[PDB]
Amino acid sequence: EIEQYSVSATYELQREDRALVDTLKFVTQAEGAKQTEATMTFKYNRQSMTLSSEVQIPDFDVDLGTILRVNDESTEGKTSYRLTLDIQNKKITEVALMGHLSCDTKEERKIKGVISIPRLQAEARSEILAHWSPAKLLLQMDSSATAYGSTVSKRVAWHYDEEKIEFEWNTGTNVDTKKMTSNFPVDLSDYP
Amino acid sequence: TLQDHLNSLKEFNLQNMGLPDFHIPENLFLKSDGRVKYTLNKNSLKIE
Amino acid sequence: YQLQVPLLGVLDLSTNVYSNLYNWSASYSGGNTSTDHFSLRARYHMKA
């Protein structure tokens, strides 16, 4: 059923419409009626500066797919970017990471970090804004997260004015017993 | 509710790990609300 | 000689803590109400 075994590291410059992908494939397989293809492929989009890593081993149900997306929104008047990371077991994103950078060198400076986990109800939010102005700089802080019936919020705002100087800070960390109980399973499949 | 838990325990046949009965308040809130504000208006006192 | 003295603004401060079975508030205000008219009213109030 097999004529030979070959292990090969084949590089290929693949086309994605506009983009060109420096694709390197690492495959270990049997050759013949029986195929033992265990492939570890890794692809980079040099036109979208995006890296993708792929592995397939059906014997152990491995179809993992990892993508690191970097999208350039940067210009002379605005340094901006958008970062995306898809943690896909069986090509299903069970952990996702996103970032949005929009910094106007003139006044606006936006930073936003997001963490989301669908199956575990784990979400974290880290968002920052800094509106510059020669007269004054305005600061805003936003950091919050939610997981298993727990709410975490941190709100700190400061602002200067000639008439007055104003500062505040509110700390929020609340937990609901029933909501946490429902969110966190206190039951197991075979335990009953 | 522990009485019902015990009744279930009589057959040694529970359904959950531990006792999901909660004595503590359903809502557990811990917060801090602090602020600093000062009126440094540009007005001034003239002195000789 | 003529000198210009910036006012000593009014200082506002309050921290209010809220936890299960115990809610606590603090509030004090300081600073001259009118630097050039010499009016002070600084007051506090601590409540548990």
CA distances from A183 to A76, A173, B42 (A): 46, 17, 54
CB atoms within 10 A of CB A131: 15
- What experiment produced this structure? cryo-EM
User: A17: which 2 tokens?
Assistant: 């419409």
The region that residue B12 occupies, defined by phi over 0 for left and psi between -120 and 50 for alpha, beta otherwise, is left
Task: Confirm or reject contact between B41 and chain A (CB < 8 A).
Answer: yes
Cα–Cα distance for residue pair A76/A181, rounded to 1 Å: 51
Q: Measure CA A30 to chain center.
A: 36
Give the closest of B30, B37, B43 to C7, CB-based.
B43
H helix runs in B1-48, sequence order: 2-10
Contact A79, A101 (CB under 8 A): yes
Q: Are the beta carbons of A164 and B27 separated by less than 8 Å?
A: no
Q: Enumerate the residues of chain C whose CB falls inside 8 A of the CB of residue B38.
A: 9-12, 31
Alpha carbon distance B45, B27 (integer Å)? 53
Q: In whole angstroms, what is the distance from residue A68 CA to residue A157 CA?
A: 33
What residue type is A82 in one-letter code?
R
Q: Cα separations (Å) of A150 from A175, A186, B18, C35? A: 5, 16, 21, 48
Cβ atoms of A127 and A150 closer than 8 Å: no
Check if the beta carbon of residue B47 is closer than 8 Å to that of residue C3: yes
Question: What is the DSSP pairing of strand A122-131 with strand A138-147?
Answer: antiparallel
Q: Is A170 in contact with B32 (CB distance < 8 Å)?
A: yes
Closest CA relative to residue A163, chosen from A136, A128, A130:
A136
Query: Are A163 and B25 a contacting pair at CB < 8 A?
Result: no
How buried is residue A133: exposed, middle or buried, by Cβ count under 10 Å (0-12/13-18/19+)?
Answer: exposed
Resolution in angstroms comes to 9.0
Cα angle value A38/A42/A45 (rounded, 5°):
155
Q: Which residues of C touch B40 (CB under 8 A)?
A: 6-7, 9
B-interface mutation test, from C19, C37, C41, most B Cβ less than 10 A away: C19
Give the residue before each break in chain B, using a C-to-N cut-off of over 2.5 angstroms; say none if it is continuous: none
The Cα A83–Cα A68 span in angstroms is: 8
The residue assigned the tokens 């006044």 is: A107
Q: What one-letter code names the amino acid at B44?
A: S
Distance CA A33, CA A1 (A): 5
Answer whether A66's CB lies under 8 Å from A97's CB: no
Phi-psi region of A149 (alpha: psi -120 to 50; beta: other; left: phi over 0): left
For residue A90, which of A66, A68, A65 has the smallest C-alpha distance? Answer: A65
Q: In this structure, what token pair is assigned to residue A182? A: 């429902």
Tokens representing A145 are 């997260």
